[PDB]
Design a protein around this nucleic acid. Structure first.
Ligand SMILES: [Mg+2]
Ligand SMILES: [Mg+2]
Lengths: 451, 422, 448, 422
DNA sequence: CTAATAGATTAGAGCCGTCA
RNA sequence: UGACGGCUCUAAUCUAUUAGU
DNA sequence: ACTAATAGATTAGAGCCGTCA
RNA sequence: UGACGGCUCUAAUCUAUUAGU
């Protein structure tokens, strides 16, 4: 009777060349990789936002409790885990006063409302950066009532100046008092508060310019890539094409995780493939990055996608392969009903089990029950992901192990594992920001700005 | 000699601050002795005073929590500590670490106020550093730091009820196999017969239109009652194709390839199943995708079928467990079966708005788990069967398809300790 | 047989609201004003430059001595004076091309060689800033002639600080000549080199070493200087830059109004009316928005007289009653004074008044506490005249005396001329040595 | 044997000043015991404090502030201080210090000011020097400085040696005043006496051309020898203008303004000074601006005048003094001179290259100071005189100007003490 | 050239809960 | 926009075939 | 008409040297 | 571009006269 193949769980690195699995415990025990020690910060908002941010900032220093320390671990303090300084006495603050005249929305054409609202903050930040003497690392903008595309436009118009920015709402920071105003309670973080502090602290530290942790089970001479198409149809012309990519390389000493981006476009409505000429430039730039960084051409290149490749656009990729490098292509799908039920008990199948129907197709269980955490990652019985080797020749089990190991790198959070590989996630993360406005040429390809 | 820096802590009382402190202390050099670290034996304070306090301890780090007055163990430890302090006549032997806040000097133990200690209430990184420098200034012995020992100890001690084991287990899938098929698929020619306007889905048997090859699984005379003017046609001009050949993918002609034929068969079986659900005493609900099939209230014996719940009441409305199916053919001819919950205002009429339907589905399905889902799915599938072993999908006068009611069974090697409970 | 006058020396502020005179002694005694702690650094250059920089940076951490420490005080170490970390272990570095195929362009077209040389460094820095994951504060570009201007000019848009060092400066111990003669001898100054390098590096990192402490509320100081541009055929001659000194409700404001207003003609230096109107409007608006009120008094420093119709245009913008007293500073007037007996010249701080308007000020003399003379020969005074407006001459004399101590570019006891003119003369060439740029930054760390 | 000094302060409020004092004292050399730097952790503080104030204390300086006025610990510590003062029989034990000086006098302690105290409102280094001199006068036992001190002792005080004393002194300027002037300026006219081509600058006496007139300073017939066909002309049509009437600026006319007349007078005096300077047995050197005048070698006794060297010999070349003069009349009618040094090879023919001239100038002038410049300038201006009182300057047949040979003097009432020679 | 049946394969876009 | 996952609901296009050319 | 010239009195650029008895 | 000062050398406008259609 058909069996299930098991794959051992990978491990991540930490300070002093140590190994662990859960990022939270490793960080609380060992520490981050590199040593940075400046978190000079500046805020923008009303007086209430400033006072709330100050209150949360000095509150974050004390140890924080969690109801189930077996599932969600402790947060002892910022100075302990990270070994840095983040106080409230070294901040710069710029008032927004009570201008607020934009609140009547102009009663119509909310697009210009969003334009003006984002313009106010953008001009404030730009003037502060250009004229003020003091040095600032990151900006925390606090916004109090209803908008749609604030987040995309804000990061879109600030891309040229290359200034990191984090967006917060005082309802989240001050959920204690922002309770039911007429009988409708909104938030309750008593069961979670430590997790919220963990996530906010990790995001702030990463934005400051520090590397918390890195993978340590990569093979030399092996590259990686991502791909996803975004739908842009606000303009009348059918565009349908926004192709970005990411790159995860093993440098001679460390690792490199960045993005290769430039909006490549395509006519036709539903043609989700890529034109023969445009793919050449993307592959050439991706190859040249590694060629210049590592002084030599890569040995193996893996391409990940959520759609199959046709014959001609894939053949175009072959004219750029230098000597023999194999561009194995993998397709990942997230909707195929194969819910497996445990025969007895009340706990579902635990993660790490994979099913092979043939030498190409496979079912992978990236979500399950973690015995170490004594809890499940998914609310209901989990559903697997379909993995298919489209073109090229390789070994399926090795690809399964690699994609399983690729799910533990999510710097935007502090979770034990992620459902899908990050290389797919970040391209979609930056696609909407790039497509919010199309007035940028040669945008930065770092990560602090888009995230 | 003595080299262990004994630190007292309330092991039974809920405390999670000593563990990481001890871990970083042992990883930063000198050794540390703890009750919670060496949790491999059960005995009272016998070996402690016998070995470490008398002969194998350099310093003490008696902590001072809020509930230290009620605990007699810390008082006895402090008594032994002051005895040895009198013995060696050293004042710097007891440093009362303070963590919590509610300790007021007015309401405090009358004996602890003897000394003052490093404060860990503000931030214990500063306390860590000041403890290290105070230990350095007194020439406390310490070995060169070997943090791999701390890592190995952390891995070793926190291992119970974790990791994986070699226990065996089985799983049941969500699919259902196909065990039979009609011998051949037929294509009929009617031309002058069939009117070019009337609809074909209304026929009592599943059949769909091709260019000439009217696709059927039955004879060439089974629609007579539905519709007249069919006896003036001969069966010699019809076409028949074997089912094994089409299923194997070997069949291929000029006009039709294999994939189109497989799609035709899939459409036929889907329509046949949809039609067969007409006479099984069940109702249907419409979705954006294909239909869902739900059961009525009261029609089933006291809302149970072999000691299992299918229809229930939620506060005011009624919830029914409905299923949907779709045929698949690539790995093996099977039927995708998906579970949904349908809500009604009393049991005869469905709630109208979709938003409250979604909210009620979330609210009701919040607190269901693997066993309930599996049991309800299996019970509904078993009940829908018209036979004690399989299900007959009726495609013609005497032709039918057979679908078993036993899902595919998998099993592996790795497993875990099931009774985690919480 | 007339009478000279004496003006008391001002004092500068320090930490904990302390006041002193010598910036070096004050810094060594109390410390900086604000608290910053990050000097993450990046260096671009060859391997030899990187190793020399590392050696010097690890040398800096230990105290240094001088032959005459009573005159120039010693340096105790970076960690003591500033209380911040700046080590050689957290430095990022990207190698330059080793073979340097651009060397033979030294004898080729100078403009093309300079353009390529500046472009290489500019592109390396831009790529590092836009792509790399690490964070950097300042860039210590190391080099082994209209080149220092263009490098800072092309980097204005990206707003990234930088600082230029030479290999021969840091390694004067071994980088001697080929004929057995030390090109640079820093034995007598060795401590002062570390002092000034440390002060500049600390300032460019976002800190503030010291600030004035004897300013009056409601008074705005403004300076002006003209630069000559004739590389293009058109006679322009007009590049007006300015600074601004303001007293904020708590601290001080030190930046510079920018935008090089032009004017035709060859030698017509003074101004045009509309440009003057725009200049005054922008200057007034800056203080008005910063302090929520119009300035009480405005002083206009300059080194050349201006006419009346343009001055009338300036008067047309005065909000209510502000007096725009204009001061002219000149430096070439021979009035050398000789001491009657001894071998020591006249001390600084003296002044000579000949009428209600003109005056001679002796900002160059010998310091009694330092027991040394700032000028090598017998010093010469500076001529001060009040052109337009009404004020009190002695107040202006003491104010301009107090304005000559805030020079962050160095760590000297005092400067010969007010820094307001000096900084505009510092930024004028950077503005005028490249293509036109719109809305340039207003921070000094970028230009310096 | 008692060495350390106990510092009493309000710990909950003020700590920075105590740290500053302790750091300065340890950097000075004297051994100091303090609260937060040496011993506070894990000991009974009262026993240590009492034994320290009883056994090994020499001075007991305290900190006085409005926050520490009503703190039990410091007041009882000071009570113990009074009790031990009444046992040691030494009154130099407690030296109070003040940090806050903005409070009314009717809130002070019962008695804390009865001894000699110092104030720290003005600064902290000056008060530190005050305490240091008090310690030196009270003969506190010294401490080994490891033969590295006296460098901070140079700068321990805010003011090293700077202060403006009230001594009187004088200074000699670089300007020489004109004490006389001839009567009237003249304007002659014939339009035919001179050709319209030859240069007037070759005339033996200064004169210039203005409109059809010749502006000049002497009589009309004085140019007869150089320009014939002139004595036949009338002298009545010539115009005379008083010198005092224009020097005061009151004079004005349509055909000539006052500032133009002043410019003309400046031109005339410059040209006349050049003409006279031509015939004083000296040589001239040409610069970018007006010439400079120097002295040939071997024209004085042993190359000096009034036992002051004026011409010297360097390693290979010879250096000579020189001056250049220009007249200005805004603050007063005066002539100002500037000093330069000119280099030759023997004393007859001088060098040609400008770069070597500049290098030799810098090298020779590297080590010349105020007295040498003053004496050389005074000697040169004295030798050039034709009289023991002033210098004549003939302009025409009999008219002449006088220039005093004593620079204007400036006296000052504020100065320094001395450069200490050394 | 545009419209109706149907399969397999893509993207958006909201709303509820925090691993018994 | 602190994160994650599970549902529910709307569109394209591509591929036999039929009819409105 | 602007082309030269001889003066007074301003105003800007560059290129070499020493180091605070 | 480490940074300050002391000099040495160039050029250009703005006035006021007189020489050339
Ligand atoms: Mg984020
Ligand atoms: Mg500089």
């Amino acid at each position: 009777m058909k069996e299930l193949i098991y794959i051992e769980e990978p491990s991540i690195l930490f300070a002093h060349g140590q190994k662990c699995t859960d990022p939270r415990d490793g960080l609380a025990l060992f520490g981050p990789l590199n040593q940075i020690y400046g978190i000079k910060s500046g805020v923008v908002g009303t007086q209430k936002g400033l006072q709330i941010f100050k209150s949360y900032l000095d509150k974050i220093q004390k140890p924080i409790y969690n109801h189930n320390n077996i599932t969600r671990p402790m947060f002892p303090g910022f100075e302990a885990v990270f070994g840095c300084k983040w106080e409230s006495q070294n901040i710069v603050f710029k008032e927004i006063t009570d201008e607020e005249i934009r609140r009547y929305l102009f009663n119509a054409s909310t697009h210009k409302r969003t334009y003006d609202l984002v313009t106010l903050f953008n001009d404030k930040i730009i003037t502060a950066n250009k004229n003020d003497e003091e040095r600032v690392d990151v900006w925390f903008v606090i916004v109090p009532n209803y908008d749609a595309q604030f987040h995309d436009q804000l990061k879109a118009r600030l891309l040229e100046h290359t200034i990191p920015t984090q967006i917060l709402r005082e309802s989240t920071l001050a959920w204690r008092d922002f309770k039911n105003t007429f009988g409708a309670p909104i938030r309750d973080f008593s069961k979670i508060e430590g997790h919220l502090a963990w996530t906010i602290s990790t995001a702030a530290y990463y934005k400051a310019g520090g590397k918390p942790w890195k993978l340590g089970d990569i093979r030399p001479g092996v590259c990686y890539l991502g791909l996803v198409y975004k739908k842009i149809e606000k303009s009348k012309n059918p565009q349908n094409a926004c192709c970005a990519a990411q790159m995860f390389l093993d440098n001679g000493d460390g690792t490199v995780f960045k993005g290769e981006v430039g909006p490549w476009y395509n006519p036709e409505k539903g043609e989700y493939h890529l034109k023969p000429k445009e793919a050449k430039a993307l592959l050439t730039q991706a190859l040249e990055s590694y060629k210049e960084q590592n002084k030599s051409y890569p040995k193996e290149v893996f391409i990940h996608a959520r759609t199959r490749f046709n014959d001609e656009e894939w053949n175009a990729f072959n004219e750029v392969t230098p000597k023999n490098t194999n561009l194995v292509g993998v397709t990942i799908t997230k909707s195929k009903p194969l819910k497996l039920y445990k025969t007895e008990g009340a706990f579902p199948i635990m993660r790490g089990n994979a099913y092979i129907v043939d030498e190409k197709k496979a079912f992978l269980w990236t979500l399950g029950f973690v015995p170490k955490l004594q809890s499940t990652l998914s609310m209901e019985v989990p559903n697997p992901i379909f993995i298919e080797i489209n073109k090229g020749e390789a070994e399926i089990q090795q690809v399964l192990k690699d994609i399983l190991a690729l799910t533990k790198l999510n710097y935007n959070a502090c979770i034990y594992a992620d459902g899908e590989p990050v290389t797919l996630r970040f391209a979609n993360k930056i696609g909407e920001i790039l497509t919010a406005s199309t007035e940028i040429k040669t945008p930065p390809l770092a990560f602090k700005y888009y995230i | 000699m003595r080299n262990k820096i004994f630190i007292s802590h309330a092991t039974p009382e809920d405390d999670d601050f000593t563990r990481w402190l001890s871990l970083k202390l042992i990883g930063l050099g000198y050794e540390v002795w703890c009750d919670i670290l060496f949790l491999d034996k059960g005995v009272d304070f016998w070996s402690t005073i016998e070995k470490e306090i008398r002969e194998n301890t350099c310093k003490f780090l008696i902590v001072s929590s809020t509930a230290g007055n009620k605990r007699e163990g810390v008082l006895k430890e402090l008594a032994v500590a002051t005895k040895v302090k009198k013995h060696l006549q050293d004042d710097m032997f007891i440093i009362p670490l303070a963590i919590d806040e509610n300790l007021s000097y007015d309401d405090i133990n009358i004996e602890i106020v003897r000394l003052n200690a490093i404060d860990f209430k503000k931030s214990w990184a500063k306390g860590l550093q000041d403890l290290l420098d105070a230990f350095e200034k007194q020439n406390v012995p310490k070995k060169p730091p070997d943090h791999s020992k701390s890592n190995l100890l952390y891995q070793q001690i926190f291992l119970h009820d974790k990791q994986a084991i070699e226990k065996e287990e089985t799983y049941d899938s969500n699919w259902f196999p196909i065990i039979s098929f009609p011998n051949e698929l037929r294509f009929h020619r009617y031309d002058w017969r069939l009117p070019k306007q009337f609809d074909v889905r209304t026929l009592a048997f599943p059949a769909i239109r091709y260019k000439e090859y009217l696709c059927t699984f039955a004879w060439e005379y089974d629609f007579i009652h539905q519709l007249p003017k069919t006896e003036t046609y001969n069966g010699q001009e019809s076409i028949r194709i074997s089912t094994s050949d089409i299923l194997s993918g070997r069949y291929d002609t000029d006009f039709i390839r294999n994939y189109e034929c497989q799609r035709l068969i899939v459409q036929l079986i889907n329509k046949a199943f949809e039609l067969r659900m007409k006479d099984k005493n069940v109702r249907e609900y419409q979705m954006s995708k294909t239909f869902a099939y739900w059961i009525e209230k009261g029609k089933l014996e006291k809302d149970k079928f072999e000691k299992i719940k299918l229809v229930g009441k939620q506060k005011n409305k009624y919830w029914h467990f409905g299923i949907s199916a779709a045929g698949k053919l690539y790995p093996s001819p099977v039927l995708m079966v998906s579970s949904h919950i349908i809500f009604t205002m009393d049991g005869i009429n469905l709630i109208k708005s979709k938003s409250i339907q979604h909210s009620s589905r979330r609210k009701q399905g919040k607190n269901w788990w693997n066993d309930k889902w599996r049991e309800k799915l299996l019970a509904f599938i078993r009940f829908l069967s018209d036979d004690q072993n399989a299900i007959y999908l009726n495609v013609g006068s005497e032709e039918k398809i057979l679908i078993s009611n036993k899902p595919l069974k998998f099993f592996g090697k790795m497993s875990y300790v099931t009774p985690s409970e919480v």
